[PDB]
Amino acid sequence: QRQDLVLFSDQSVLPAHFFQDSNSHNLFFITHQSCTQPLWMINALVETHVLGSPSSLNESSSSMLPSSTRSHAVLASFIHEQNYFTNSLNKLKIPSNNYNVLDFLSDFIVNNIHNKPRDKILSDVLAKFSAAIQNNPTDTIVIIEQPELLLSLVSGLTCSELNNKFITPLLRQCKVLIIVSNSDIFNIDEYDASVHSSNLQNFYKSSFIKSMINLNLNPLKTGFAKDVTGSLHVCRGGAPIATSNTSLHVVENEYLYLNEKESTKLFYR
Amino acid sequence: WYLKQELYASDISYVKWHPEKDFTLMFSDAGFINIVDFAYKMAQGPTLEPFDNGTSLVVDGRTVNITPLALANVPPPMYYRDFETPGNVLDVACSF
Amino acid sequence: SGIAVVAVMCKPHRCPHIAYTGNICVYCPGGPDSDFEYSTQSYTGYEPTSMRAIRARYDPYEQARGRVEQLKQLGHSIDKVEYVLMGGTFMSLPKEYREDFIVKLHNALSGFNGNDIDEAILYSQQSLTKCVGITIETRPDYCTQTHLDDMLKYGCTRLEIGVQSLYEDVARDTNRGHTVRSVCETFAVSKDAGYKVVSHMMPDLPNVGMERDIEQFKEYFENPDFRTDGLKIYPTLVIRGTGLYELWKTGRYKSYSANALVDLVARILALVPPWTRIYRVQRDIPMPLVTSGVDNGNLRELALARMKDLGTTCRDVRTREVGIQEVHHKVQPDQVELIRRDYYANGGWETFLSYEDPKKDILIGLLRLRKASKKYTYRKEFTSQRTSIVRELHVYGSVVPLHSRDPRKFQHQGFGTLLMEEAERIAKEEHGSEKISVISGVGVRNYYGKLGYELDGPYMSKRI
Amino acid sequence: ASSSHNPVILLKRILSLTESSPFILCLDSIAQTSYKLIQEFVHQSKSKGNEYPIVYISFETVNKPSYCTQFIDATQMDFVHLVKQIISYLPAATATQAKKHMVIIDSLNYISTEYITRFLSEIASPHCTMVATYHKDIKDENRTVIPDWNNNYPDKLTLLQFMATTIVDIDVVLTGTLDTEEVSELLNEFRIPRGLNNDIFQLRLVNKRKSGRSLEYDFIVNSNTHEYELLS
Amino acid sequence: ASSSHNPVILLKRILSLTESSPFILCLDSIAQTSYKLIQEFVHQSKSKGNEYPIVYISFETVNKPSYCTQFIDATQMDFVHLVKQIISYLPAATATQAKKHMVIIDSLNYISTEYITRFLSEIASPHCTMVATYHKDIKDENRTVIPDWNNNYPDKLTLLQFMATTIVDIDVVLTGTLDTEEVSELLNEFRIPRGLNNDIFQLRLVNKRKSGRSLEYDFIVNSNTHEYELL
Amino acid sequence: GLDSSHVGVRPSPATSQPTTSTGSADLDSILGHMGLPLGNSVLVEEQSTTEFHSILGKLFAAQGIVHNRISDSSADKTRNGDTHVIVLSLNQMFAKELPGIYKGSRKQMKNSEYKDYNHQFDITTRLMPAPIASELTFIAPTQPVSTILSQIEQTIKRNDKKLIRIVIPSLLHPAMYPPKMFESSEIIGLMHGVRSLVKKYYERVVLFASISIDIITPPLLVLLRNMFDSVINLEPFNQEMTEFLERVYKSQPGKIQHGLVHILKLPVFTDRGEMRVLKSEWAFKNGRKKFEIEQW
Ligand code: SF4
């Protein structure tokens, strides 16, 4: 029943030579319907970057502690806190010391962003990663989680300023960037966000233009069943692949996935 | 139900199957850890044209049942031209 | 063309299985004892056929003649009609009533005015407006060999024996008088006689869960005993006058929601073997008198949307039929092949032959063949040597256009001969039979008498 | 008349800059991005041999284009600077007899409408060729303009269609089991099904001539062998 | 005590002001204005043998009607003074349910939404009985919602529908050979076919009762013989 | 570590985690944990102008006071249970609105040892009497967010022993909340900081809130719904269905219901990637004793 998870022509999810090529950049865009959460995919990405294989889906997860590995990993998010990241991701056993974890929720709201000039806020939030990645320059992967929420935090900010002040510098400085977000704004029944709420959707469209691969986790259609949870889509993003080899491209396939007790299963219709 | 396979021993302590893998069971023999493995395999006769008649062989305890396909499409549950062995059966082969 | 279905009604009565259980089965609505009291059981008397039967005071001659004339006057011309009987248990009634009923039903079309049913059927064989069989409804307790001989003499071709469940508590708690296991021997004896057999099911019943509903159908389709040639699925709807409404009144009953039922139907339709014709998941109900349940007019209209979202769409006969002539010939079909399946069912080997398009899975023609066993046959025709029976011939391959160079002006008129000779080949070679027989309605006893089959008793047989 | 007797010849003359065009506009969307047409420019305009400075002014792009010879990042310049640090690389409006270069603008959606015409006024010269793409799925920002009943002026799309001398529209050719209705729907609720963003695409060409009506045709363009086929 | 009122009798009961709430909303358009509605109020209110002193607030009315006793015109003067002048002709006491000072408003379109509540929070006294009117078709001014990403505040219609205890709306029946589709077509062209501003109109009523529930009531009203019937 | 008092808690049958109880009858059953896990907030919603949910907004809070008031020389175990309930409203009527205990029965059977569990409640009976400011406090919401965020942290820090239960009665009611706070940044930042504080003290703090959605634009609702970790929606029947039920139900006054229940989000169950949305299956009813949720 079970099927392998392949995302490239080289029969490998995350090619190693991507990290071996200098003067290059790449961007992944992941969208999940907010009735489900893509954590079980972030875990797989981190394991396959560090351990070199999907250590929860295709491989066993009994030695899942990538701490103090020759590689590196940096995760930052706004939706949750440092306490949740430590306690949970260590209960999920996501590494610590060869690893960086960044909160922007706990105690950050209380007059540390509020009632301060916007330019200083943007400069400092960029400098956090600009300084946290100086240690290991070329063997890290960085993922940001739902950054568009910050748009609603800053007093009167549009897509363009946030994008050109946060996203593009991050991808220029770092090798590869992964951005994950949710898409409820496009799923309000009998209401059009295109009336006056297009500012947020502009960010999604811009990111999809700039992205290289597009990962989609979407819920089932009309009803709810037991043996299947959701649908998994892989698509080619807007930007082309900045690699140096020529035969490389992206495989094109759709999966049906079930999640239960942190255990995920993928198969075909 | 068919009696597909037997195993012989002179002692038993406990038997445990495998959670992830299957057809790999546990047993002991006077303090000796033992592991076995099984797999599906379908018996078949010759395939070449000079003797091309699909002959399917099945085992049921002390009995062997035959079915020559392309001469009869006899279904699984009923079989054709049996013969009863004095003992049970663990593997069967045919000629050319 | 001109296939016609003309339903008739029998006089009201009482099925005797009440006698050893006390009342009718719980789900049966109406009846003589109910307030209606001029109506056969399982029918409220408010159907159009009920109206046409009442005004005739339940007489077969008038009902048949009136329905035939109405259909002819509407704009269709009829030359092929199949009768179906309804209501209670027709076989319970005394001897003379059934004989007179059958003789009247045949003399309505034949134009004959005699008696001595043998002569009536003999004249009906040589008549215009041919009859293509009868459909008699009966219970397991009345399918003994004498009754089977009676039905064979009458001219019936297919039965429909309901089971309604495979569990054993349901039989006693629904006040139905037969153990489940006896239906298997009933099927075994019936099939060897050439009678196509169809069953009934009802998904929701008291003290039955969604699980048990699932694996009862799974066991029905998998077990080599419950393999039959048709099915009918009746979702449980609660009429006020039934014994089901009392349970809801006392609070001893509750039903399923809409989502649960549509999911169940979606799962069920994804398991049907390709030789069984799902008759009606969207059955016909007395609408306003139902008090509990859900709407059933478009269950499959949503189940199809469900299979399009989960995959593995239906594979029954009905969805794959192309018909006699130009139903879906708006597009030229694809590769045509012969597909032959074999299965073990009710103590015997049976073969299903079909002419199908494998790329898009449509159906053009089919045939069924059975190799007679030795532990169930009793007829003096089948107890003399080995023999095989063609239970059903079905040729929608009367289609004029086709794929792969259809006959120009011969237009598949010899298409059925292909299947007939194909059947005879394996009858002579594989079965090793010494006689082959085909069962058919009396009106079509000549489309088989040209290929060489000769008449013995109610059968069309030829040796090898 | 006796010039460009085949539409394909006209397209190739346009692509290879055989005939000068002061302004050309290309329209695209999310269903098909518009970086293959820059490859078309690079490949076709090299048969005539235009190695002349292919400046790539960028607003959003993170990567440096190999096919181009220059790279300018405009996430820190204002309008006057942005004009000023381009006239150097380009053949600015001096040396009335000189060569011509190539200009590639990555995006047009990040610029306020208030200066659009001026961005085509200070630079328009018989030495420069402006090429830029317009994403149609991004609705611009209009809180600052305050479109009340007394503060009105035309929208960006009409000005772009007016000041253009040649217009090309890009579309992705439907290949599998997706049609326009359900495609546009799924894009509206952002499910992005398979069957999108291929190299084989389709174009609509509108070419304007002086003192006359423009010509409108359609094309099928492959991005593999660089060959064209006119609409039947 | 009377309960489970006959729907026609209940319609009279509200119209006779046997019950009372500190806020009542009435809606009108350019097809049927509400002068005859006030006529029905006074006809079935003072027929009980009651005076019902009336205070009038005008934003669209031009002349002093016969219904009101006192008078105040609010076009020249503004909010900060109307919050004062409203109390001058309105004592702060209890018992809305009976003969008190009834404050009537002809139009509510001309007050900023940002201060709708600040207004209404200081008027609906237990002695005060408020009734107001709103024009449905007139579009709200663009500077009342601030359609930017900051202002999540709702519009004017929903705010009034959520706040008012009871809602009454009216529409004109076209006795002519036309259809309301054609009437809308001509009105979108600002054209008036013959048959508007009649006296036999239709009414829709909603009252919030039983801890918040509501029931919609429809009738047929004749404003000459004061005939209320079911539709 | 540090000292802590849990006013009442049992292991979660579903995942072996500390779980409190709202005091409800079937709402705690349908929360998946047979209770509310220590740390995850909840949300309940109503379609129409009715105020059914208001009843629930009382029960929870009252339960805590009981769980604190039946330990002072009334529980022989004298087990360490302390709560300091905080209410954010502009009207103080709640201070005299807690419903009364029916007969007690805080049994759970079917740092200290916590056996306390739900009680038996009835709506007609008022409480006897009501807590003093030392047990329960009121904070007006109209004050600037800086003061509120400082004061909540001060209250929790200065009372480290106590268990924390917070209730927000009818958040975003236009009669008390001005338009100057309907602006997008204000409320979302307020709740973002509230979530920060709540999950910071993950051991014992629990929060509860409810709003009205009929008068809220969908974008703000979407922004808000990601702040919490559980969403329950109550939709009352239409008038026609109610009349149909009353016309059919002639032998039962208790079988009359008011509407149905929809499940949009659950506790930690959902963060492991579980599709838990389930709508148009349950039916709610307010009752003389408690709040009933049954199958329809
Ligand atoms: S056996 Fe048939 S006729 Fe008799 S009670 Fe049952 S359903 Fe009715």
Numbering used by the authors:
A (entry chain I): 5 to 273
B (entry chain A): 387 to 482
C (entry chain C): 94 to 557
D (entry chain E): 2 to 233
E (entry chain H): 2 to 232
F (entry chain G): 67 to 176, 231 to 416
Give the authors' words.
In eukaryotes, wobble uridines are modified by Elongator, a large and highly conserved macromolecular complex. Elongator consists of two subcomplexes, namely Elp123 containing the enzymatically active Elp3 subunit and the associated Elp456 hetero-hexamer. The Elongator complex harbors two copies of each of its six subunits, namely Elongator proteins 1–6 (Elp1–Elp6). Decreased levels of wobble uridine modifications lead to ribosome pausing, incorrect protein folding and consequently trigger intracellular protein aggregation and proteotoxic stress.
